[PDB]
Design a protein around this ligand. Structure first.
Ligand SMILES: Nc1nc2c(ncn2[C@@H]2O[C@H](COP(=O)(O)OP(=O)(O)OP(=O)(O)O)[C@@H](O)[C@H]2O)c(=O)[nH]1
Ligand SMILES: Nc1nc2c(ncn2[C@@H]2O[C@H](COP(=O)(O)OP(=O)(O)O)[C@@H](O)[C@H]2O)c(=O)[nH]1
Ligand SMILES: COc1ccc(N(C)c2nc(Cl)nc3ccc(F)cc23)cc1
Ligand SMILES: [Ca+2]
Ligand SMILES: [Cl-]
Ligand SMILES: [Mg+2]
Ligand SMILES: [Mg+2]
Lengths: 346, 437, 54, 424
């Protein structure tokens, strides 16, 4: 009989995991500070990795990889891609990006050298800015940096994807959320079900001050959008409908046009940081669920925009996914008395 | 040639000192009576080994060592064991009753009544020293003597020998072999009082030694004897540069120079490889590359932590056996490409290397196999602050209830010393965080 | 990656390898502390003995 | 190092005699005090409990105290009677009539100085006396009344030594007189103030063990004391036997007692034996030792939480297995161990087993469930005290009702203090 401890109550995914674990009758929950746990669903901030794996007679396991933040916060990920030989500044699936600090190392003097070549070559020069609410997509820099310095935290600004793939009917934008689970053996498991977070507003390439047809966040779309839910329930198109659309409209499969690139990107990113974060020979073990956010361009080329280290699922997919986390991440380590994951290896 | 006096305090200090001096004698060819035939300079010398042994007119080589415990049973075993002749009686000092696992009983109550005797005996060794460079102090964190008497002694040494270096070999507390529930209290108290009196401290966590013994020595339930032969190997590796010809870490000041840039962060992590059971029938001898690479596996560290999530301030590689520089550089070159090794910005990324061609001596009948080459890495990584976190946490749990505090206060200590010590430790932890993230 | 201060002798050699450049109280106060604690101890003993005498 | 032992009253002397029989046997000493064992583990620390006398003799460091001579005589005539030095027999003639006040205030006072004379003589022959252990019941008169008088006198003369007691608690199931709750409540008030560590030996728990599991229909005091001497040999093995952990009375205090007053220990023992053939496995030993049915203080450990635990395994067995099983008990029941005392369970191993067992386990818990014991006494106390019943036996010896009220309050305070940490 295994014991666990819950230190992030505001996690929908791991709340479901707690319920599933208890309902096995082989897992009992302890109080959040009891150190005699087998399993820890840790807090999102300052998780105490230094205190794991020092409890004799307890194989201990945690649902986060110490160090994974380098992938999962925007400036960090830009730094990691530019400086890591495995990915390199010549990375063909990450947009041109730069790390800018407020007025109060920085890359705006290296930014401008590229931006002005974009304006002179008469290329589309839209750029987006964000950090880890407060977004600015503009066409000239002096709006961007001016906005950055009104706030007070490090920012990344990166080449906006001016020619996205637009779903018809609707002429609307979307992003693709993939859920990936890395186990204590560093198997990389892609969940078979992804989701397309769409916009409900036709794509208006004119004024970039309206964020309703350019940003695809489930929050901004329920509140500030006209017809949230006209085409798909909750502004969420799942994979079967999207594959059907690709076949009907574009004469391809989701697997061929897009998924190959997503599996390639995921594996590349994770394999890159594996030496820094692996717990293969550590006194405690880690697994982690990630949410990779992808954007497809009108040429069916996949791009990576954010990696989120503590993602939520889609209400339709919570059950199946959380059960998978238990199956492959937890019961692998603590056995009880046709898989929903594609294993990524090459 | 400049002399070194070793001071062993409490049970853990005394038993580890036994193990180290047994090793030393084996390594320098000193017999249990104290006779070293290869020493042609009879009755004296300024050789490298003389920093740890004085000579008598009768050709007897005698450890520059003092053993001090507040109860007699453990040092009595020194007095009656294989190396009884080795030590001169005045250097084995015992009390009548121990400190009862109580820092304040060792520091204040029983400490006050034996501190002057100990300092007198230490002065009798120092007075035999043409140019004493200082002290190597062995002790547990957790014992009442080990913590409380040791901190009192360090304070005094700073006063009677203010220009001299003081080094610590400190046993960090582990549940699997611990003897008391109050070891976190004692750990924090003694760390806080000693911090400004120690130039360089090598912390050994009994948890790590215990698991190394189980995993690599196939010892099912390690004893103090197992642990201490392994620790003595590590200690010998660390001190060999004071006892042998060489150009690296030749005096105690060089340990601080090479390993402690900021004076407060003076806890270098020790990683040791290879540890091979004497009961391994067929062993394939490991290369320079394999053992150097093992230096970066946490499972070989004297303290379990993760240097990948820290920063280095210094790094020394001490080899013993069949090693040459070009093989070391080759090993380092490939390791750098395959491993997370980040130094602090204001420090060079590099390695000071020491090689002694004589391979490790192993205790006949011990648990360790002989090997053609071995290495001890000493690296000042901030990752060791994990060990303070753990410790400080276990303190905070108990102290929030003032549990057991009445035993300390009843010895004359004031409750405020507790929160003072804890505050120092909060400082220390923050220094580490700021240097390394 | 350059190799410096190579010093060598019949017992062994030492050297450095660079990979990249850089980016107390007095005896008085002490015996005062020890004696203060003895005073708190003696006082608690006297409280104890006085209570026992009651 | 040296321990001085005092047994007071009928119960004190009967159990103390049994304690000396058992551990004398364990250390190879015979009723004449001449060593005859084979091994040498038996002598390494033999001086903790025995003085060496002329002719390689071993003489227990034991003072025998009573106000009537009937039991003391019975000891002299008993098995090991002649191993005690006769000068250490200190007795009066009038008894104490199961009356705490006679033991503490009138008859006891008359005899206590000479007892302290013998104490002093034993202690000045000590190189480093660590303290005293007292055996006594709390429901009679000499043991409870005079024994607690002795304890506060000893504390006055030796304020820096350890006072430890084995204190048998009264139960209506095994009862001599109705005034036993009175005698017990007075004494606990003394114990809470003037001992460092008390083993609460509940005569209720002893009766229930003899009856419900040893299948004895009519338990005698003999059947009870066999349990008591098993427990006593168990909890003192790390004191009298050389092991890795070189234990003494003060370290046991320091590690077992997080707060001075809560120093009342629940002892346990396994396998429970009557006055067998199947060897116990280490997992079985460990499960039994922790079982409520093996504990000598009738308290449900699931009704409170363990502050500290110390456990002793006697026999040749697997240290590895012992470690695994102790860790399993804690990790599979961590609810019942306070989280604010990290690693509060310590284990020790002695190769030598008790007589007639290849393996055995002794348990020493400082549980907050011990409050149940005192609640029991307090209820019985109040039932009488609210009608001032039987008080005249006590006011006849000079006592004021006020003193009863004070002692009752201090015990109810003790109960509340235990309830404080059961919920922390
Ligand atoms: N590694 C190792 N640790 C030891 C040894 N002896 C004791 N310890 C550790 O030291 C701590 C107890 O400290 P001790 O040195 O035994 O106590 P002390 O300094 O003698 O002080 P007292 O309380 O007076 O007995 C525990 O954590 C033990 O595990 C030893 O021989 N080797
Ligand atoms: N366990 C145990 N309890 C006893 C024994 N003799 C008496 N008692 C208990 O002790 C209490 C009576 O005290 P007792 O020792 O006989 O009186 P005293 O001689 O005046 O101190 C009652 O609770 C008895 O049950 C004994 O041999 N074993
Ligand atoms: C809760 O932590 C501790 C730490 C140390 C102790 N010591 C001091 C012991 N003393 C005596 Cl007399 N017998 C023991 C028997 C078993 C054991 F494991 C320990 C002890 C007790 C509890
Ligand atoms: Ca010489
Ligand atoms: Cl000086
Ligand atoms: Mg000791
Ligand atoms: Mg009676």
């Amino acid at each position: 009989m295994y014991t666990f401890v819950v230190r992030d109550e505001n996690s929908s995914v791991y709340a479901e995991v707690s319920r599933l674990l208890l309902a096995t009758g082989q897992w009992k929950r302890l109080r959040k500070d009891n150190p005699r746990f087998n399993l820890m669903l840790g807090e999102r901030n300052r998780l105490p990795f230094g205190r794991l794996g020092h409890e004799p007679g307890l194989v201990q396991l945690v649902n986060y990889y110490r160090g994974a933040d380098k992938l999962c916060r925007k400036a960090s990920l830009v730094k990691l891609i530019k400086t890591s030989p495995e990915l390199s500044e010549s990375c063909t699936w990450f947009p041109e990006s730069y790390v800018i600090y407020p007025t109060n190392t920085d890359e705006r003097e290296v930014f401008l050298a590229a931006y002005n070549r974009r304006r002179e070559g008469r290329e589309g020069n839209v750029w987006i800015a964000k950090s880890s609410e407060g977004i600015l997509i503009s066409s000239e820099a002096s709006e961007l940096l001016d906005f950055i310095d009104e706030q007070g935290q490090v920012h990344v600004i990166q080449k906006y994807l001016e020619k996205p793939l637009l779903l018809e009917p609707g002429h609307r934008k979307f992003d693709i959320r993939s859920w990936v689970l890395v186990d204590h053996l560093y198997n990389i498991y892609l969940y078979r079900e992804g989701v397309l977070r769409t916009s409900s507003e036709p794509y208006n390439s004119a004024n970039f001050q309206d964020k309703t047809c350019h940003l695809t966040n489930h929050c901004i779309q329920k509140e500030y959008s006209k017809n949230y839910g006209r085409y798909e329930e909750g502004n969420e198109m799942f994979f079967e409908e999207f594959n059907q659309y690709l076949m009907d409209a574009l004469n391809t499969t989701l697997e061929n046009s897009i998924l190959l690139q997503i599996k390639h990107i995921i594996r590349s990113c994770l394999m890159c940081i594996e030496p820094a974060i692996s717990t293969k020979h550590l006194h405690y073990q880690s697994f982690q669920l990630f949410g990779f956010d992808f954007m497809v361009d009108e040429e069916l080329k996949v791009w990576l925009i954010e990696v989120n280290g503590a993602p939520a699922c889609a209400q339709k997919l919570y059950a199946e996914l959380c059960q998978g986390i238990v199956d492959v991440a937890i019961s692998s380590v603590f056995p009880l008395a046709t898989s929903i994951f594609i294993k990524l290896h090459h | 040639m400049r002399e070194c006096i070793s001071i062993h305090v409490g049970q853990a200090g005394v038993q580890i000192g036994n193990a180290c001096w047994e090793l030393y004698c084996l390594e320098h060819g000193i017999q249990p009576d104290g006779q070293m035939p290869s020493d042609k300079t009879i009755g004296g010398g300024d050789d490298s080994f003389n920093t740890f042994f004085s000579e008598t007119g009768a050709g007897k080589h005698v450890p520059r060592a003092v053993f001090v415990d507040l109860e007699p049973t453990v040092i009595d075993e020194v007095r009656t064991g294989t190396y009884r002749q080795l030590f001169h009686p005045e250097q084995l000092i015992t009390g009548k009753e121990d400190a009862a696992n109580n820092y304040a009983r060792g520091h204040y109550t029983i400490g006050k009544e034996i501190i002057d005797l100990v300092l007198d005996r230490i002065r009798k060794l120092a007075d035999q020293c043409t140019g004493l460079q200082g002290f190597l102090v062995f002790h547990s964190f957790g014992g009442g003597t080990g913590s409380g008497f040791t901190s009192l002694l360090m304070e005094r040494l700073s006063v009677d020998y203010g220009k001299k270096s003081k080094l610590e070999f400190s046993i960090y507390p582990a549940p699997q072999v611990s003897t008391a529930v109050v070891e976190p209290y004692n750990s924090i108290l003694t760390t806080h009082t000693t911090l400004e009196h120690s130039d360089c401290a090598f912390m050994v966590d009994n948890e790590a030694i215990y698991d190394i013994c189980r995993r690599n020595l196939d010892i099912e339930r390690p004893t103090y004897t197992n642990l201490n032969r392994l620790i003595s190997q590590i200690v010998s590796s660390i001190t060999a540069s004071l006892r042998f010809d060489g150009a690296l870490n030749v005096d105690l000041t060089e340990f601080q120079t090479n390993l402690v840039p900021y004076p407060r962060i003076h806890f270098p992590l020790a990683t040791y490889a290879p540890v091979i059971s004497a009961e391994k029938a067929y062993h394939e001898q490991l290369s320079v590359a394999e053992i150097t690479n093992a230096c970066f596996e946490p499972a070989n560290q004297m303290v379990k932590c993760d240097p990948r999530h820290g920063k280095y301030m210094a790094c020394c590689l001490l080899y013993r056996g069949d090693v040459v520089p070009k093989d070391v550089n080759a090993a380092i070159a490939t390791i750098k490409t395959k491993r997370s090794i980040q130094f602090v910005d204001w420090c060079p990324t590099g390695f000071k290397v020491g090689i002694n061609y004589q391979p490790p001596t192993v205790v006949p009948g011990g648990d360790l196999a002989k090997v053609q080459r071995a290495v001890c890495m000493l690296s000042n990584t901030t990752a060791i602050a994990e060990a303070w976190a753990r410790l400080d946490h276990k303190f905070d749990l108990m102290y929030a209830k003032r549990a057991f505090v009445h035993w300390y206060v009843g010895e004359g200590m004031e409750e405020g010393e507790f929160s003072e010590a804890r505050e120092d430790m909060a400082a220390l932890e923050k220094d580490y965080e700021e240097v390394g993230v | 990656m350059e190799v410096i201060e190579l010093n060598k002798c019949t017992s062994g050699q030492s050297f450095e390898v660079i990979l990249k450049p850089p980016s107390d109280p007095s005896l008085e106060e002490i015996q005062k502390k020890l004696e203060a604690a003895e005073e708190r101890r003696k006082y608690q003993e006297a409280e104890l003995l006085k209570h026992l005498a009651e | 190092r040296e321990i001085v032992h005092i047994q007071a009253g009928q119960c004190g002397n009967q159990i103390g005699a049994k304690f000396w029989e058992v551990i004398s046997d364990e250390h190879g000493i015979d009723p004449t005090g001449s060593y005859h064992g084979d091994s040498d583990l038996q002598l390494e620390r033999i001086n903790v409990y025995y003085n060496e006398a002329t002719g390689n003799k071993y003489v227990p460091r034991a003072i025998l105290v009573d106000l009537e001579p009937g039991t003391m005589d019975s000891v002299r005539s008993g098995p090991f009677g002649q191993i005690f030095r006769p000068d250490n027999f200190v007795f009066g003639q009038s008894g104490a009539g199961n009356n705490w006040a006679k033991g503490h205030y009138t008859e006891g006072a008359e005899l206590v100085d000479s007892v302290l004379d013998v104490v002093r003589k034993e202690s000045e022959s000590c190189d480093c006396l660590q303290g005293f252990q007292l055996t006594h019941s709390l429901g009679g008169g000499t043991g409870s009344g005079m024994g607690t008088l002795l304890i506060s006198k000893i504390r006055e003369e030796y304020p820096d030594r350890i006072m430890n007691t084995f204190s048998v608690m009264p139960s209506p199931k095994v009862s001599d007189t109705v005034v036993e709750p009175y005698n017990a409540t007075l004494s606990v008030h003394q114990l809470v103030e003037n001992t460092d560590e008390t083993y609460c030996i509940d005569n209720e728990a002893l009766y229930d063990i003899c009856f419900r599991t040893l299948k004895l229909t009519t338990p005698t005091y003999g059947d009870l004391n066999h349990l008591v001497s098993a427990t006593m040999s168990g909890v003192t093995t790390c004191l009298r036997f050389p092991g890795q952990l070189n234990a003494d009375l003060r370290k046991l205090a320091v590690n077992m007692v997080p707060f001075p007053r809560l120093h009342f220990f629940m002892p346990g023992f396994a396998p429970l034996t009557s006055r067998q053939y199947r060897a116990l496995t280490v997992p079985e030993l460990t499960q039994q030792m922790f079982d409520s049915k093996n504990m000598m203080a009738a308290c449900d450990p699931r009704h409170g939480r363990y502050l500290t635990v110390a456990a002793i395994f006697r026999g040749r067995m697997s240290m590895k297995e012992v470690d695994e099983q102790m860790l399993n008990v804690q990790n599979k029941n961590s609810s019942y161990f306070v989280e604010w005392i990290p690693n509060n369970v310590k284990t020790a191993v002695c190769d030598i087993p008790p007589r007639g067992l290849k393996m055995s386990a002794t348990f020493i818990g400082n549980s907050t469930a011990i409050q149940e014991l005192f609640k029991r006494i307090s209820e019985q106390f109040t039932a009488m005290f609210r009608r001032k019943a039987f008080l005249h036996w006590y006011t006849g010896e000079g006592m004021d009702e006020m003193e009863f009220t004070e002692a009752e309050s201090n015990m109810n305070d003790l109960v509340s203090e235990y309830q404080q940490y059961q919920d922390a």
